């Protein structure tokens, strides 16, 4: 189910090439014939509007799109009733006999799980969790527990739920704590890192992504090649340059990801160019990272520009440590940036107190701002006194 959500996401906003939606149209048209995408197929028009969302032959009659294959027809209408019969009506008579005759426990619980998976493709989340609750009482070992974490996860990836998914996953894992192997534990931890993209936790998104193995593949929830982009972009976003050398640039699993798929261009281009202190070739590497990774991915679109901005401020800070005073013919000449545009970069970064630096107008000498004898023993030393005083006087003033 993830292969359709990744390709059809290009139908939202494409400012570069139309062929990106044309190549993705072949994947959407092929999957809707074998299986019924109607809950997600209709959700495309109800998600984003005034781009591809206005074209429909059923709910609202309009044409706005670069692709005409998103409109309903008589073929998908007949296939919608076929899924409600073979997957539901035919199984409903078989599962009813097992409930009355009382044959087995785990064998019958698997029938309710397979039935609940059919409602995910149909789009009914009420009966999907209802049949799961009946099989939850019959489940004992971890064999039936693996499909429980996916049912809640299908709301986030498929139904696009950023709220009720995180609360339900924490309740199931807390009631019965097993975890299986590391790949089963990733299914909980992968969403925790992805959920940080919606609430904008910044570096807290890659906390559980870096520790997760590169062999994690959820199929319908997520694919093998796509999950490699989340750990590569957020991994460099969180871990500093010192951690990039012993973890990112040299890894057994990570280096095998970019060799198979060349669409990453993160753990290599953004690293090796930084290790060589070359910012001239480092600038165009952000194009393939933004255009070919962040844009086509769904959850990576929540931030977008927020990614490459903090990556530039991070690499500009490393240049300030190698020289006390910089020159105008160094940053603003060989690296490709321009005096007018480069001044807008650090122009808003300095008052944010994210990076301290001095930019010159006439002579064009960039000076590195250092606390010198201040460091962390001046402002950060006295901040902990009053910072903890509020929480210390919280229960002291009001007693109980």
């Amino acid at each position: 189910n993830y292969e359709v959500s990744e390709k059809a996401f290009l139908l939202t906003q494409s400012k570069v090439s139309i062929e990106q939606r044309k190549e993705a149209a072949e994947f959407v048209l092929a999957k809707i014939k074998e299986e019924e995408m109607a809950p997600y197929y209709k959700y495309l028009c109800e998600e984003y509007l005034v781009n591809n969302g206005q074209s429909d032959l059923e709910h609202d009659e309009k044409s706005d799109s670069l692709n005409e294959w998103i409109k309903f027809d008589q073929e998908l209408y007949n296939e919608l009733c076929k899924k409600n019969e073979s997957k539901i009506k035919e199984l409903n008579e078989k599962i009813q006999k097992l409930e009355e005759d009382d044959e087995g426990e785990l064998e019958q619980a698997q029938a309710w799980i397979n039935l609940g998976e059919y409602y995910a493709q149909i789009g009914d989340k009420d009966n999907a969790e209802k049949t799961l609750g009946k099989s939850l009482s019959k489940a004992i070992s971890t064999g039936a527990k693996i499909d429980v974490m996916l049912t809640i996860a299908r709301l986030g990836f498929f139904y696009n739920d950023q709220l009720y998914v995180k609360e339900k996953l924490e309740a199931v894992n807390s009631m019965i704590e097993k975890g299986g192997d590391w790949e089963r534990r990733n299914r909980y931890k992968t969403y925790y890192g992805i959920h940080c993209l919606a609430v904008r936790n910044f570096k807290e998104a890659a906390k559980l992504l870096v520790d997760s193995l590169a062999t994690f593949t959820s199929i319908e929830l997520t694919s093998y090649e796509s999950i490699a982009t989340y750990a590569s972009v957020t991994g460099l976003f969180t871990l500093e340059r010192t951690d990039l050398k012993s973890k990112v640039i040299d890894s057994p699993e990570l280096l095998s990801l970019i060799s198979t798929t060349a669409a990453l261009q993160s753990i290599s281009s953004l690293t090796i160019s930084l290790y060589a202190s070359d910012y001239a070739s480092y600038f165009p590497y952000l194009l393939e990272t933004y255009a070919n990774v962040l844009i086509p991915c769904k959850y990576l679109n929540r931030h977008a520009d927020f990614f490459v901005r903090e990556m530039r401020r991070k690499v500009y800070a490393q240049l300030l440590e190698s020289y006390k005073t910089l020159s105008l013919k160094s940053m603003a000449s060989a690296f490709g940036v321009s005096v007018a545009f480069l001044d807008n970069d650090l122009g808003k970064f300095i008052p944010n107190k994210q990076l301290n630096c001095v930019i010159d107008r006439v002579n064009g000498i960039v000076e590195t701002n250092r606390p010198d004898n201040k460091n962390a023993q001046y402002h950060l030393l006295v901040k902990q006194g009053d910072g903890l005083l509020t929480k210390l006087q919280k229960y002291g003033a009001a007693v109980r």
């Binding site: 400012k15 904008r200 520009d305 901005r309 807008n344 808003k348």
Partner: peptide, 27 residues
């Protein structure tokens, strides 16, 4: 938490970033 979330920037998207590639050959 200050000058961060909703205000954002509203620049550095495409036109400004794509212009910096032409400056390399103009030197």
């Amino acid at each position: 938490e200050n000058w961060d979330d909703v205000e954002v920037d509203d620049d550095f998207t495409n036109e400004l970033k794509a212009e910096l590639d032409r400056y390399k050959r103009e030197n």
